[PDB]
Amino acid sequence: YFQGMKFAVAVSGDRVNGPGESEEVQIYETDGGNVRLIEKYSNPALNATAARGVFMLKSALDHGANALVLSEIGSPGFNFIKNKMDVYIVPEMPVADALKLILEGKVSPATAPTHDHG
Numbered sequence: 001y002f003q004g005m006k007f008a009v010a011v012s013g014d015r016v017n018g019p020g021e022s023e024e025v026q027i028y029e030t031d032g033g034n035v036r037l038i039e040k041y042s043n044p045a046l047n048a049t050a051a052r053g054v055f056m057l058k059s060a061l062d063h064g065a066n067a068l069v070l071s072e073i074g075s076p077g078f079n080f081i082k083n084k085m086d087v088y089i090v091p092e093m094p095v096a097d098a099l100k101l102i103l104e105g106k107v108s109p110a111t112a113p114t115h116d117h118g
Contacts, residue, residue: 002103003032007088008065009095010043010056016090016098018072020045020052027063028099035099039063053077061085067109069098078113089114 006029010022017023023046027039045056054077060068067086081087086109090098101107 001032001105002030005030005066006038006064007067007069007099007102008060008063009069009098010071011040011095014094015092016069016071016095017092018053019043019056019068019070019077020048020074022056025056025059025063026095027060027065028095030099030103032103035096035103051076054080057081067102069095069102072114073110075113075116075118078110086110 006027009026010017010019011026012023022043024040025043028035029038043056044059045052048055053074057077057080069088071092073087088102088107089110090107
């Protein structure tokens with residue numbers, strides 16, 4: 001399932017955090033078991049005044065990610081991304097530990113946002 005996929009992770013201090021507030025976007029490539037960091041950059045969301053989560057997600061799309069790894073996602077962001085790639089919501093935990101759970105099938109893709117004020 002996961003062979004070749006690229007994951008965009010929203011990260012602060014090597015922990016998975018939320019799309020609008022994380023310090024960095026980290027892009028990992030996998031063969032299903034081995035994982036490699038192929039890119040990382042300051043989260044563009046931090047420069048947005050509004051719709052910060054959406055703008056991190058747009059950045060992930062720009063960067064060719066196939067899936068997202070986040071601690072949360074709002075309604076605007078989920079509606080933006082939901083037909084473009086999968087979102088895996090995880091605890092605010094170390095990146096490698098989250099990716100292990102995801103790759104081992106222990107985190108099903110989100111079908112709804114985790115918060116909604118629409």
